[PDB]
Amino acid sequence: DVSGTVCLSALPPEATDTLNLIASDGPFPYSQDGVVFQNRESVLPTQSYGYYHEYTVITPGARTRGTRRIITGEATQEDYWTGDHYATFSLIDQTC
Asked: List the disulfide bonds.
């Protein structure tokens, strides 16, 4: 299930950075950025393989990718934030 919507401006600024890189098709800081996200917990709506992709959202100070990601869906303006290492997701609203 998706945990509502969240305005882009209410997320860490690195979320904005990741979306800007997605808009430019990269390049991205981590090699996993852009890999297919399989939605294995069926947390997001069911779609076929390749509908979703995942991108790092950098955590300041972290040596690793940390817990923050954006998952794109193929639909226009369909992007999911998680701040808790894929446990939950919220739809990102870039209009606010």
From this structure: 7-96
CATH number of the domain at 1-96, please?
Answer: 3.10.450.30
Which DSSP string corresponds to 31-70? TTTTEEP--TT--SPP--TTSEEEEE-PPTT-SS-TT-EE
The whole-angstrom separation of Cα 56 and Cα 71 is 9
Active site residues per annotation: 54, 85
Distances (CA, A) of 3 to 50, 52, 88: 22, 17, 7
Sorted by sequence, the CB contacts under 8 Å of residue 14 that are 6+ apart come out as: 57, 58, 59, 60, 68
